[PDB]
Amino acid sequence: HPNAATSDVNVTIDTFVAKLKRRQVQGSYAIALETLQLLMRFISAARWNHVNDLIEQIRDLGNSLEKAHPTAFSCGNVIRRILAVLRDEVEEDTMSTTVVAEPLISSMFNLLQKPKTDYRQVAIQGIKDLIDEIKNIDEGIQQIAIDLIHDHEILLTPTPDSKTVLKFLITARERSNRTFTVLVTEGFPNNTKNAHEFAKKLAQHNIETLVVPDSAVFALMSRVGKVIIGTKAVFVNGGTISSNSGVSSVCECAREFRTPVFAVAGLYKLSPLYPFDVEKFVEFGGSQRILPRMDPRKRLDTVNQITDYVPPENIDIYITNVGGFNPSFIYRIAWDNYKQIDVHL
Amino acid sequence: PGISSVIPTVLEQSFDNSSLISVKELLLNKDLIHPSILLLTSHLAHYKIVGSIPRCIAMLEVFQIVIKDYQTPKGTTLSRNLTSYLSHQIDLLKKARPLSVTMGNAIRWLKQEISLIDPSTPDKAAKKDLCEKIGQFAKEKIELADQLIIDNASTQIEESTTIVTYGSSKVLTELLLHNAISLKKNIKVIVVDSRPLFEGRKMAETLRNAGVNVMYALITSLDTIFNDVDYVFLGAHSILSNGFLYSRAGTAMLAMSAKRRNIPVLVCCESLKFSQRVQLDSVTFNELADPNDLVNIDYENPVERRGNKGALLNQFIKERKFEKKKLAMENKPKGNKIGGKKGSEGESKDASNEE
Amino acid sequence: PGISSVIPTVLEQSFDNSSLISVKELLLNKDLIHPSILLLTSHLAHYKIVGSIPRCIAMLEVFQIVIKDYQTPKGTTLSRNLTSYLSHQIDLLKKARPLSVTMGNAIRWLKQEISLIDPSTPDKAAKKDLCEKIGQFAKEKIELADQLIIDNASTQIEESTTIVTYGSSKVLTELLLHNAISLKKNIKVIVVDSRPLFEGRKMAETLRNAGVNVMYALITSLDTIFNDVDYVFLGAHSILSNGFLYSRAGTAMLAMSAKRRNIPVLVCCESLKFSQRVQLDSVTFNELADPNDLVNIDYENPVERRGNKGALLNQFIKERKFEKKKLAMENKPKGNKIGGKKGSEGESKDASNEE
């Protein structure tokens, strides 16, 4: 379905699209919030009474959005979650309208063999619930994080950008008796300013700062205790796409020198799409912030990428609001909130 | 002698194996110091281009110049205070910035030469043959060695080659150029470079000036170009009698990656770069400059800007340290090509007795 | 009221988090305590036989006994100060020897039971049915599971065997005994012991009590031990949210050795022992004990020699510390034998939400 009714029925769809394409919007969380708001708007004014059709429309909407931007996934994920929420309710409803138990929460063979209400209010409530979840993940991660940090241990932190990760760090630092020193890589292309900001914030609280060049990790890794990330996108076979610069090489180094790798994670930040090739999911960067002047660019070839992908061979734990989980296991977690049908929309 | 100590930057709780600062801006210099040494010091202090090989050559040249300028006094003999002078110069160099193994070797050779010629021979005739012999030495233990390296590379490197490197090692540059214009072949040459220095950039520029297809690379994503890459040389500086390489920047990471993915890593060297001293980690003996090299927003080198950065003591504790020289590994750099032609770094000192 | 303070020996520097102190010899307490709990605590503290499997059973038995003895007061209902009593018991237990994962599970179950029948009932009807229920539960989730495990193991052996062993795993003792007796195969058993507590010795004794072909050795004596020999077995205490082997002491090294020397390892587990507490290291929370576990000079346990060592608090600058519970490497042990016969420990919490 195209954008024919979805322009005067709801107000700021075009604005949202613009924000997505031209990157007026800042923050994955913020994107998610915007998506939620859009969904709310869709719900409030428009009337349907027919449910399956509505669901299909929503799927189409989500799909189009996803196709609009091949590396921002939060928007998609939120929509998927909402779909999932709706679907179970619909299934429940059908059984009442018309008027068997499984070994666990979900069966496998049911996919091969043949299997007015205050629903709007429930839907409304769902969005609110989602919003609340998005607001207070940290109040659920807090007492799962302070379960794996000790004394006299060097802590490496590449890509420190989010308000979540910072807060996590702050909570740990509050218990100042717990001894930890912070090494922070600057992150060449984009992370630099952000890294500096993070360092400043650390200093504000009285947290010991060490500013790191990206070439110099091999020289530090043997002294590094525990490594924490604050990723953007979480995946199927265990790996992640992190918010830009210097993560692959770091991970390789860790693997070689055998180093523990923490990752701050959220299930809404987690994607059920499988990454199969480097040739697609890895997002490249601008040469504008490398070298001024364009006449040397005639013969040479500058190669740079913003956000980078991680193979699961390296990271080991995903500290969520639910708990820290294994990378060669997180698929189950995802499926406890997502499906195999809502994949290729 | 001048001014020592009284300088900014803390002692650093992490890494303090060598001292960190010195003499940059000249005032009250002694009335006997040769200007060439001073100028060299001034250069090295804020140097972009040179690293290991050309530095030594420059030093040699300077020494030759000094010798030319020197004549036997009426009171003091030819071997009376020369050695003292040399020592002073070495101390000045050390104060400025720590040195290389090749340099040490050269110094040793000079000392030997001082002993060899007896203080009774005609003075004019003495330095006549001295400067000739030094020139000969330079030709043999550098230029000839370089030639030999080139020829070694020639037999080994295949028809049509993609070569990936890091640094500013002049030998490698020469080799690349040779491959481009002299023997003539297809050369996809990729160079990597870090934040503080622009060695790689400079090399790329040089290659362009000779007309080569180049890819300019950075740390944040090396893998993106390998995952294709077939043959790789590293930034050679100094080998120890273990079988390692005390070398520049995150070359070690690259080497590791190479080891992981298909291919061995290889290095060319001069048969006088070798030491007999040994070490085994990037903590052992660190080569340091000021944490001021990374305050400015990148792009160029001399800029002067206003923004946010400029806090080494101002805010609530802020340490912004780095390294220049690190440890390259052993099991991976299997290739070594020298003045004695061939060998493995596993055979770490099989030419040190042969000399 | 109780007793705190006065602790033996120096507190070292690292691994400073868990309770390791205390009432070893009793001196004044609170006045309504049933002494069976206290006795049990005393036993557990100075125990040299217990190893994961039986402790929980013992605890259950004790609880049963308590229930049987329990008199409901003439005033207040069946659970008013009972909860307080239970809390006190727990506190005592912790003071003596930490609550394990199985113990936690048991506590949870008890709490559930308490909730199930809320205050409204008399005495000899409620507890009559409670005791029976709990017995039935014990019969179900424990003994039968063990039997199942045994029978799984029985098939797991094919033709011709030579094995190396460790640990006071009651189940493993049962297993090996079963092999010896009611399977009559060619079962060879090699035993490894440990200093903190003598489990290996006990195992050996048990083997003897059958008349088994037994070799015996220790943690270090292994390099010669493999010079035909295939199987290796371990006895884990608990598995967390992670799939990591959070068990007793000398396992991990052995496992590593086995991995290195070609033929893999298999461990056995129970379908109640899994936890939602998350950790990936030894340091987080460990069974830490008094250094008196390292005073004796070899051979046996009660000998007491005035040889070379016998002091701790007077030893200025000396940090004698040992660990009891470890966290073994995830990918190393291959097979795990729980209620659902066979599976990879990559399962971790596959039965945790299943409950």
Side-chain angles (χ1 to χ4, degrees), chain A residues 117-153:
Chain A
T117 185
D118 52 79
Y119 158 74
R120 289 172 177 164
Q121 208 170 303
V122 181
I124 290 155
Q125 275 211 37
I127 318 149
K128 285 174 188 172
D129 270 62
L130 257 277
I131 287 155
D132 275 290
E133 125 81 65
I134 276 133
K135 288 270 179 182
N136 298 305
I137 334 142
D138 278 295
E139 287 182 44
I141 318 158
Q142 57 160 119
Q143 294 163 66
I144 283 93
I146 325 157
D147 284 83
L148 277 141
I149 335 106
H150 292 100
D151 289 44
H152 271 270
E153 286 187 313

mmCIF file of all heavy atoms in Angstrom, chain A residues 117-153:
data_model
loop_
_atom_site.group_PDB
_atom_site.id
_atom_site.type_symbol
_atom_site.label_atom_id
_atom_site.label_comp_id
_atom_site.label_asym_id
_atom_site.label_seq_id
_atom_site.Cartn_x
_atom_site.Cartn_y
_atom_site.Cartn_z
ATOM 1 N N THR A 117 -15.339 -5.485 21.112
ATOM 2 C CA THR A 117 -14.604 -5.477 22.388
ATOM 3 C C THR A 117 -13.770 -4.197 22.581
ATOM 4 O O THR A 117 -13.578 -3.423 21.635
ATOM 5 C CB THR A 117 -13.753 -6.768 22.580
ATOM 6 O OG1 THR A 117 -13.141 -6.765 23.877
ATOM 7 C CG2 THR A 117 -12.666 -6.909 21.506
ATOM 8 N N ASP A 118 -13.282 -3.988 23.807
ATOM 9 C CA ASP A 118 -12.439 -2.833 24.161
ATOM 10 C C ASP A 118 -10.973 -2.990 23.704
ATOM 11 O O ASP A 118 -10.038 -2.611 24.422
ATOM 12 C CB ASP A 118 -12.544 -2.527 25.668
ATOM 13 C CG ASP A 118 -12.280 -3.748 26.544
ATOM 14 O OD1 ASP A 118 -11.100 -4.101 26.751
ATOM 15 O OD2 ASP A 118 -13.258 -4.344 27.040
ATOM 16 N N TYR A 119 -10.804 -3.519 22.490
ATOM 17 C CA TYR A 119 -9.524 -3.861 21.884
ATOM 18 C C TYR A 119 -8.690 -2.616 21.621
ATOM 19 O O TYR A 119 -7.478 -2.638 21.813
ATOM 20 C CB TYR A 119 -9.766 -4.670 20.596
ATOM 21 C CG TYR A 119 -8.637 -4.679 19.583
ATOM 22 C CD1 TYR A 119 -7.473 -5.427 19.804
ATOM 23 C CD2 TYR A 119 -8.744 -3.954 18.391
ATOM 24 C CE1 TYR A 119 -6.442 -5.437 18.871
ATOM 25 C CE2 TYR A 119 -7.721 -3.958 17.452
ATOM 26 C CZ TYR A 119 -6.574 -4.701 17.696
ATOM 27 O OH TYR A 119 -5.560 -4.707 16.766
ATOM 28 N N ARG A 120 -9.354 -1.543 21.198
ATOM 29 C CA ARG A 120 -8.688 -0.279 20.911
ATOM 30 C C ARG A 120 -7.991 0.262 22.163
ATOM 31 O O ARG A 120 -6.838 0.687 22.104
ATOM 32 C CB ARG A 120 -9.678 0.730 20.316
ATOM 33 C CG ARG A 120 -10.112 0.375 18.898
ATOM 34 C CD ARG A 120 -11.239 1.251 18.378
ATOM 35 N NE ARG A 120 -11.566 0.923 16.989
ATOM 36 C CZ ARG A 120 -12.678 1.288 16.352
ATOM 37 N NH1 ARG A 120 -13.613 2.008 16.963
ATOM 38 N NH2 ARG A 120 -12.858 0.928 15.090
ATOM 39 N N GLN A 121 -8.686 0.185 23.292
ATOM 40 C CA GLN A 121 -8.142 0.636 24.560
ATOM 41 C C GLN A 121 -6.894 -0.176 24.930
ATOM 42 O O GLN A 121 -5.882 0.385 25.351
ATOM 43 C CB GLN A 121 -9.206 0.552 25.652
ATOM 44 C CG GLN A 121 -9.019 1.557 26.774
ATOM 45 C CD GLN A 121 -10.212 1.622 27.707
ATOM 46 O OE1 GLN A 121 -11.338 1.885 27.284
ATOM 47 N NE2 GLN A 121 -9.967 1.394 28.993
ATOM 48 N N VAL A 122 -6.976 -1.488 24.725
ATOM 49 C CA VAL A 122 -5.857 -2.394 24.983
ATOM 50 C C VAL A 122 -4.645 -2.008 24.123
ATOM 51 O O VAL A 122 -3.520 -1.941 24.612
ATOM 52 C CB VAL A 122 -6.249 -3.891 24.824
ATOM 53 C CG1 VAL A 122 -5.069 -4.810 25.120
ATOM 54 C CG2 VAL A 122 -7.403 -4.252 25.754
ATOM 55 N N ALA A 123 -4.917 -1.722 22.852
ATOM 56 C CA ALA A 123 -3.897 -1.310 21.902
ATOM 57 C C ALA A 123 -3.207 -0.027 22.378
ATOM 58 O O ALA A 123 -1.978 0.074 22.361
ATOM 59 C CB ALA A 123 -4.491 -1.136 20.512
ATOM 60 N N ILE A 124 -4.030 0.925 22.827
ATOM 61 C CA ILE A 124 -3.576 2.214 23.371
ATOM 62 C C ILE A 124 -2.619 1.970 24.545
ATOM 63 O O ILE A 124 -1.526 2.553 24.624
ATOM 64 C CB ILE A 124 -4.768 3.115 23.828
ATOM 65 C CG1 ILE A 124 -5.575 3.624 22.628
ATOM 66 C CG2 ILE A 124 -4.296 4.308 24.663
ATOM 67 C CD1 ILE A 124 -7.015 3.983 22.947
ATOM 68 N N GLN A 125 -3.055 1.084 25.436
ATOM 69 C CA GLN A 125 -2.296 0.740 26.618
ATOM 70 C C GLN A 125 -0.946 0.130 26.259
ATOM 71 O O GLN A 125 0.035 0.415 26.916
ATOM 72 C CB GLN A 125 -3.092 -0.152 27.575
ATOM 73 C CG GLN A 125 -3.991 0.640 28.519
ATOM 74 C CD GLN A 125 -4.192 -0.020 29.876
ATOM 75 O OE1 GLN A 125 -3.277 -0.638 30.431
ATOM 76 N NE2 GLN A 125 -5.391 0.127 30.429
ATOM 77 N N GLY A 126 -0.942 -0.736 25.244
ATOM 78 C CA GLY A 126 0.262 -1.359 24.719
ATOM 79 C C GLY A 126 1.361 -0.355 24.392
ATOM 80 O O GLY A 126 2.517 -0.523 24.802
ATOM 81 N N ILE A 127 0.981 0.689 23.655
ATOM 82 C CA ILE A 127 1.914 1.742 23.240
ATOM 83 C C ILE A 127 2.512 2.416 24.475
ATOM 84 O O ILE A 127 3.723 2.637 24.540
ATOM 85 C CB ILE A 127 1.246 2.813 22.340
ATOM 86 C CG1 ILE A 127 0.320 2.173 21.302
ATOM 87 C CG2 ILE A 127 2.302 3.665 21.641
ATOM 88 C CD1 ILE A 127 -0.861 3.042 20.931
ATOM 89 N N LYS A 128 1.647 2.707 25.451
ATOM 90 C CA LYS A 128 2.054 3.337 26.710
ATOM 91 C C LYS A 128 3.083 2.468 27.426
ATOM 92 O O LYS A 128 4.109 2.964 27.897
ATOM 93 C CB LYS A 128 0.848 3.603 27.627
ATOM 94 C CG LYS A 128 -0.037 4.774 27.221
ATOM 95 C CD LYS A 128 -1.271 4.865 28.109
ATOM 96 C CE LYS A 128 -2.259 5.899 27.594
ATOM 97 N NZ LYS A 128 -3.547 5.854 28.336
ATOM 98 N N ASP A 129 2.791 1.166 27.475
ATOM 99 C CA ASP A 129 3.661 0.165 28.093
ATOM 100 C C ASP A 129 5.042 0.192 27.441
ATOM 101 O O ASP A 129 6.077 0.213 28.125
ATOM 102 C CB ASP A 129 3.061 -1.247 27.967
ATOM 103 C CG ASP A 129 2.161 -1.619 29.134
ATOM 104 O OD1 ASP A 129 1.131 -0.945 29.349
ATOM 105 O OD2 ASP A 129 2.476 -2.610 29.826
ATOM 106 N N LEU A 130 5.021 0.206 26.107
ATOM 107 C CA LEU A 130 6.233 0.223 25.304
ATOM 108 C C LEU A 130 7.076 1.463 25.633
ATOM 109 O O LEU A 130 8.296 1.374 25.834
ATOM 110 C CB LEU A 130 5.907 0.127 23.801
ATOM 111 C CG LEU A 130 6.071 -1.162 22.964
ATOM 112 C CD1 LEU A 130 7.508 -1.336 22.484
ATOM 113 C CD2 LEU A 130 5.587 -2.438 23.646
ATOM 114 N N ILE A 131 6.384 2.601 25.708
ATOM 115 C CA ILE A 131 6.991 3.899 26.034
ATOM 116 C C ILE A 131 7.687 3.820 27.392
ATOM 117 O O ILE A 131 8.835 4.248 27.550
ATOM 118 C CB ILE A 131 5.946 5.058 26.007
ATOM 119 C CG1 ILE A 131 5.550 5.399 24.563
ATOM 120 C CG2 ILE A 131 6.469 6.315 26.707
ATOM 121 C CD1 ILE A 131 4.184 6.043 24.414
ATOM 122 N N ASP A 132 6.967 3.248 28.352
ATOM 123 C CA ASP A 132 7.468 3.116 29.705
ATOM 124 C C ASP A 132 8.729 2.251 29.736
ATOM 125 O O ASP A 132 9.710 2.606 30.391
ATOM 126 C CB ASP A 132 6.378 2.638 30.673
ATOM 127 C CG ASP A 132 5.533 3.788 31.214
ATOM 128 O OD1 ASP A 132 6.056 4.592 32.015
ATOM 129 O OD2 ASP A 132 4.344 3.884 30.843
ATOM 130 N N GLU A 133 8.691 1.152 28.979
ATOM 131 C CA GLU A 133 9.825 0.230 28.833
ATOM 132 C C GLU A 133 11.049 0.982 28.302
ATOM 133 O O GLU A 133 12.165 0.870 28.844
ATOM 134 C CB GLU A 133 9.427 -0.993 27.960
ATOM 135 C CG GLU A 133 10.281 -1.325 26.725
ATOM 136 C CD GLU A 133 11.549 -2.106 27.033
ATOM 137 O OE1 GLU A 133 11.449 -3.262 27.495
ATOM 138 O OE2 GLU A 133 12.650 -1.563 26.802
ATOM 139 N N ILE A 134 10.798 1.778 27.267
ATOM 140 C CA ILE A 134 11.850 2.542 26.632
ATOM 141 C C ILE A 134 12.471 3.548 27.613
ATOM 142 O O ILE A 134 13.694 3.671 27.676
ATOM 143 C CB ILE A 134 11.449 3.074 25.236
ATOM 144 C CG1 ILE A 134 11.696 1.962 24.214
ATOM 145 C CG2 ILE A 134 12.267 4.295 24.830
ATOM 146 C CD1 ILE A 134 10.558 1.730 23.247
ATOM 147 N N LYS A 135 11.611 4.195 28.401
ATOM 148 C CA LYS A 135 12.021 5.126 29.452
ATOM 149 C C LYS A 135 12.928 4.470 30.508
ATOM 150 O O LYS A 135 14.023 4.981 30.787
ATOM 151 C CB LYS A 135 10.792 5.760 30.137
ATOM 152 C CG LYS A 135 10.023 6.783 29.311
ATOM 153 C CD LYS A 135 10.540 8.201 29.509
ATOM 154 C CE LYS A 135 9.767 9.194 28.653
ATOM 155 N NZ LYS A 135 10.286 10.582 28.791
ATOM 156 N N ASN A 136 12.476 3.364 31.100
ATOM 157 C CA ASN A 136 13.175 2.777 32.248
ATOM 158 C C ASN A 136 13.690 1.348 32.026
ATOM 159 O O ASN A 136 13.261 0.393 32.688
ATOM 160 C CB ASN A 136 12.335 2.922 33.530
ATOM 161 C CG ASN A 136 12.075 4.377 33.903
ATOM 162 O OD1 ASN A 136 13.003 5.175 34.050
ATOM 163 N ND2 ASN A 136 10.803 4.726 34.062
ATOM 164 N N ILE A 137 14.614 1.229 31.071
ATOM 165 C CA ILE A 137 15.388 0.003 30.855
ATOM 166 C C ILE A 137 16.466 -0.068 31.931
ATOM 167 O O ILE A 137 16.656 -1.114 32.550
ATOM 168 C CB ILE A 137 16.098 -0.047 29.471
ATOM 169 C CG1 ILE A 137 15.380 0.799 28.413
ATOM 170 C CG2 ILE A 137 16.272 -1.490 29.006
ATOM 171 C CD1 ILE A 137 16.321 1.514 27.467
ATOM 172 N N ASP A 138 17.146 1.064 32.143
ATOM 173 C CA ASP A 138 18.281 1.201 33.066
ATOM 174 C C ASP A 138 17.959 0.837 34.512
ATOM 175 O O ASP A 138 18.795 0.250 35.200
ATOM 176 C CB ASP A 138 18.851 2.624 33.005
ATOM 177 C CG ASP A 138 19.811 2.826 31.844
ATOM 178 O OD1 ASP A 138 20.891 2.191 31.838
ATOM 179 O OD2 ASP A 138 19.496 3.638 30.946
ATOM 180 N N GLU A 139 16.751 1.185 34.955
ATOM 181 C CA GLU A 139 16.251 0.809 36.281
ATOM 182 C C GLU A 139 16.021 -0.704 36.402
ATOM 183 O O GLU A 139 15.823 -1.223 37.505
ATOM 184 C CB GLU A 139 14.983 1.598 36.621
ATOM 185 C CG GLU A 139 15.243 3.063 36.961
ATOM 186 C CD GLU A 139 13.989 3.837 37.340
ATOM 187 O OE1 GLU A 139 13.152 3.313 38.109
ATOM 188 O OE2 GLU A 139 13.843 4.985 36.873
ATOM 189 N N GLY A 140 16.058 -1.395 35.260
ATOM 190 C CA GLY A 140 16.020 -2.856 35.191
ATOM 191 C C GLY A 140 17.360 -3.514 34.880
ATOM 192 O O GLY A 140 17.538 -4.699 35.171
ATOM 193 N N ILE A 141 18.289 -2.765 34.276
ATOM 194 C CA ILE A 141 19.660 -3.254 34.016
ATOM 195 C C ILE A 141 20.557 -3.056 35.250
ATOM 196 O O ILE A 141 21.444 -3.878 35.509
ATOM 197 C CB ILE A 141 20.327 -2.594 32.772
ATOM 198 C CG1 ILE A 141 19.350 -2.471 31.596
ATOM 199 C CG2 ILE A 141 21.550 -3.390 32.322
ATOM 200 C CD1 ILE A 141 19.721 -1.415 30.575
ATOM 201 N N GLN A 142 20.298 -1.981 36.004
ATOM 202 C CA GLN A 142 21.123 -1.526 37.149
ATOM 203 C C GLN A 142 21.616 -2.600 38.127
ATOM 204 O O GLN A 142 22.776 -2.576 38.543
ATOM 205 C CB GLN A 142 20.418 -0.401 37.931
ATOM 206 C CG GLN A 142 19.032 -0.746 38.474
ATOM 207 C CD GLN A 142 18.584 0.167 39.597
ATOM 208 O OE1 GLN A 142 17.569 0.852 39.481
ATOM 209 N NE2 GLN A 142 19.337 0.180 40.694
ATOM 210 N N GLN A 143 20.729 -3.530 38.477
ATOM 211 C CA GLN A 143 21.012 -4.561 39.478
ATOM 212 C C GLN A 143 21.313 -5.927 38.837
ATOM 213 O O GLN A 143 21.160 -6.985 39.463
ATOM 214 C CB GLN A 143 19.870 -4.625 40.505
ATOM 215 C CG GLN A 143 19.740 -3.362 41.352
ATOM 216 C CD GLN A 143 18.405 -3.258 42.066
ATOM 217 O OE1 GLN A 143 18.090 -4.061 42.946
ATOM 218 N NE2 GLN A 143 17.617 -2.254 41.698
ATOM 219 N N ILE A 144 21.746 -5.871 37.577
ATOM 220 C CA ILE A 144 22.286 -7.009 36.830
ATOM 221 C C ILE A 144 23.722 -6.643 36.404
ATOM 222 O O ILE A 144 24.591 -7.516 36.279
ATOM 223 C CB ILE A 144 21.349 -7.409 35.647
ATOM 224 C CG1 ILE A 144 20.130 -8.192 36.156
ATOM 225 C CG2 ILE A 144 22.039 -8.297 34.620
ATOM 226 C CD1 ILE A 144 18.899 -7.363 36.450
ATOM 227 N N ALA A 145 23.958 -5.340 36.225
ATOM 228 C CA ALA A 145 25.277 -4.786 35.905
ATOM 229 C C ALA A 145 26.253 -4.840 37.086
ATOM 230 O O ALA A 145 27.367 -5.349 36.931
ATOM 231 C CB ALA A 145 25.144 -3.365 35.376
ATOM 232 N N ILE A 146 25.835 -4.330 38.253
ATOM 233 C CA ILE A 146 26.656 -4.371 39.483
ATOM 234 C C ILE A 146 26.639 -5.794 40.070
ATOM 235 O O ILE A 146 26.200 -6.025 41.205
ATOM 236 C CB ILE A 146 26.252 -3.307 40.548
ATOM 237 C CG1 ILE A 146 25.796 -1.994 39.899
ATOM 238 C CG2 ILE A 146 27.417 -3.033 41.497
ATOM 239 C CD1 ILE A 146 24.907 -1.136 40.781
ATOM 240 N N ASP A 147 27.109 -6.738 39.255
ATOM 241 C CA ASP A 147 27.189 -8.158 39.588
ATOM 242 C C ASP A 147 28.428 -8.790 38.946
ATOM 243 O O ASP A 147 28.685 -9.984 39.130
ATOM 244 C CB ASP A 147 25.926 -8.898 39.122
ATOM 245 C CG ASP A 147 24.727 -8.645 40.021
ATOM 246 O OD1 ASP A 147 24.053 -7.608 39.846
ATOM 247 O OD2 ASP A 147 24.444 -9.494 40.893
ATOM 248 N N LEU A 148 29.190 -7.981 38.205
ATOM 249 C CA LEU A 148 30.318 -8.465 37.402
ATOM 250 C C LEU A 148 31.526 -7.508 37.318
ATOM 251 O O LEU A 148 32.405 -7.695 36.468
ATOM 252 C CB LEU A 148 29.825 -8.840 35.998
ATOM 253 C CG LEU A 148 29.193 -10.217 35.775
ATOM 254 C CD1 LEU A 148 28.005 -10.118 34.831
ATOM 255 C CD2 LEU A 148 30.216 -11.219 35.261
ATOM 256 N N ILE A 149 31.570 -6.498 38.191
ATOM 257 C CA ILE A 149 32.726 -5.583 38.280
ATOM 258 C C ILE A 149 33.371 -5.649 39.667
ATOM 259 O O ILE A 149 32.672 -5.709 40.684
ATOM 260 C CB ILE A 149 32.391 -4.100 37.947
ATOM 261 C CG1 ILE A 149 31.171 -3.960 37.026
ATOM 262 C CG2 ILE A 149 33.596 -3.400 37.325
ATOM 263 C CD1 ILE A 149 29.931 -3.463 37.742
ATOM 264 N N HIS A 150 34.703 -5.623 39.691
ATOM 265 C CA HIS A 150 35.475 -5.793 40.924
ATOM 266 C C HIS A 150 36.417 -4.622 41.215
ATOM 267 O O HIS A 150 36.136 -3.479 40.841
ATOM 268 C CB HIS A 150 36.256 -7.110 40.871
ATOM 269 C CG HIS A 150 35.387 -8.327 40.913
ATOM 270 N ND1 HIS A 150 35.048 -9.036 39.782
ATOM 271 C CD2 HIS A 150 34.784 -8.956 41.949
ATOM 272 C CE1 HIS A 150 34.276 -10.054 40.119
ATOM 273 N NE2 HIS A 150 34.100 -10.028 41.429
ATOM 274 N N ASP A 151 37.520 -4.927 41.902
ATOM 275 C CA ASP A 151 38.555 -3.964 42.268
ATOM 276 C C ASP A 151 39.872 -4.237 41.530
ATOM 277 O O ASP A 151 40.174 -5.388 41.191
ATOM 278 C CB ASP A 151 38.784 -3.986 43.786
ATOM 279 C CG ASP A 151 37.626 -3.377 44.573
ATOM 280 O OD1 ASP A 151 36.446 -3.669 44.269
ATOM 281 O OD2 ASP A 151 37.903 -2.609 45.520
ATOM 282 N N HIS A 152 40.638 -3.162 41.306
ATOM 283 C CA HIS A 152 41.940 -3.173 40.601
ATOM 284 C C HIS A 152 41.875 -3.780 39.186
ATOM 285 O O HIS A 152 42.705 -4.622 38.817
ATOM 286 C CB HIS A 152 43.046 -3.828 41.457
ATOM 287 C CG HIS A 152 43.772 -2.873 42.356
ATOM 288 N ND1 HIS A 152 44.910 -2.200 41.963
ATOM 289 C CD2 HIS A 152 43.533 -2.491 43.633
ATOM 290 C CE1 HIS A 152 45.335 -1.438 42.956
ATOM 291 N NE2 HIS A 152 44.516 -1.596 43.981
ATOM 292 N N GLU A 153 40.883 -3.340 38.406
ATOM 293 C CA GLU A 153 40.661 -3.852 37.044
ATOM 294 C C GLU A 153 40.454 -2.748 35.999
ATOM 295 O O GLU A 153 39.577 -1.888 36.138
ATOM 296 C CB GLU A 153 39.511 -4.876 37.014
ATOM 297 C CG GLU A 153 39.869 -6.237 37.615
ATOM 298 C CD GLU A 153 38.790 -7.297 37.442
ATOM 299 O OE1 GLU A 153 37.602 -7.015 37.712
ATOM 300 O OE2 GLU A 153 39.137 -8.433 37.047
#
